Structures are given as C-alpha cells and as structure tokens.
Design a protein around this ligand. Sequence first.
Ligand SMILES: [Ca+2]
Ligand SMILES: [Ca+2]
Length: 279
Amino acid sequence: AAQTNAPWGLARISSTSPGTSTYYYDESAGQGSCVYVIDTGIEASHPEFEGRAQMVKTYYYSSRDGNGHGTHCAGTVGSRTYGVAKKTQLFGVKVLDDNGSGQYSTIIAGMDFVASDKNNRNCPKGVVASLSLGGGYSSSVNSAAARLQSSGVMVAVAAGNNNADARNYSPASEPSVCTVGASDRYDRRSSFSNYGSVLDIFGPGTDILSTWIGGSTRSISGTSMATPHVAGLAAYLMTLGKTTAASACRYIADTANKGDLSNIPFGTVNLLAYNNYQA
Ligand SMILES: [Ca+2]
Ligand SMILES: [Ca+2]
C-alpha cells in the first residue's frame, strides 16, 4: 500500500533514503495487534483513530487527554493518516497529568497495569507498549519496564531529550527494553536526542505531524515522537509474523538502515528504523 504526501517520518521508515514523501506498507497494517500508549491519555473520539482507540486506565480525575502529548504519540502509532500501524488497536493509560508530568510511583503502577491488562484484551498478533516519558535514573522504574517486557510486551521507550548519555535516565537506561533516539528529515541526530550504548535504534523525531486534542493536528519534536514510530513498527511487524514481542527490538535493529545518520557519537548505534517493505 502507498500513502502519498505522508508525514516525512512515515516515508522515512519505509525508505532506504531520506527525501521522499510516500509511505509504503503492507495492508495488514498491524491488524490484530495492540499498542498501549502510556502517557497523558488519548482523545479517542478523534476521527483519525476511527474507533480503534480507547482509554483503559487513568490515575487522575479524568481519562481525558487535557494536554495533547499522548494523543500525538498515539497518532504516530496508529492514526489513519499519521500512523505507522493504521489498523492496530490503541489503548490509553493516563499516567501523566494534563501538564505532562507524573510521579514515578504512578508510572510504575501503569506499567504493571499493562502487563496484567493485556490478559483482558484481544491481541492475537501481540502487544506493544509505547513510553514517551522519563526522568532521572531509577532502578524501580527500570525494573517495572523490565517486568513489562518480560511479561510478553514489546516495550519501546524514549531515550530522552537531554543531548546526553541515556545511561542517566529512566526507563531509557533499562537494557531489556527498546530505547529509541530521534533523527531529523535530513538524517541528522536530532539536536536534543540522547545517545549512548543503551540506545537500540533511532526513529523520526524532529518536526513530526500527528493528531492533537480538540480534533486537531500539529507538528512537535522529541524522542517522544521517535518512540511511537518504533512501537507502531513493532506492532506492524508482529502482525506480519516476522518477529515477536520478545525479539522485535533486536529484529528492528537487525533490519534497520545502517550508517545513514550524522552526528552519531562514537559508541552509539547508527541504526534507523525501517520496515523493509517490498511490494
Ligand atoms: Ca540509506
Ligand atoms: Ca535495549
């Protein structure tokens, strides 16, 4: 399938080269998979989600996304126009308040929630969790992410936006999950992207158009934007049967575009998420 005039990041994930504008993907499109977006929520009524999004948990007075960040990330995972996996099921877990902040204790509860809640859902092609969040190093946050992954969920987490080594941030620094850095449309490391040995992969993160609250759209930047490209890619590849929740991060690294990115510090992988879709 071909989506013309797609956001650059979608075009990039199905291309060997920068500078194109059409996204190519297998029409299965992540059908039968599920992606949990652990964030500020998801505006499920947005026409872009086509009834495929729902809120499943909140730790606050509402499950509404009063911020936009979670809705944007969910859009990159699975919206019809802005998403990688256009037929996946999206589940919102609101661990971040409407200012975009959340206590680590709440974030941990949210991860444990997903590990159990997947047993309440129909995801025959597998389960992914996208975590566009984080703060300073915490062994408890890392351990929660490790548990979620161990439980059979493909966990993708943001590397962070500190232009620093991700070793000092969580859940970025948890080795067993998929830690995602950000690139721009010219195949440069995004200016803010963290780096380091713990990164598994890069995805598009600068100037990413997606859904926003109030039935709108907007372009924003962050490792938060790169992460859902990888989460959606995992869901897509799992629906195709090419990989599994336990092996998807490795598979994505195996099949990535190699050596395309600039300003990657010595010791950080030069790997850009790629669907290897061949019609
Ligand atoms: Ca290339
Ligand atoms: Ca890893």
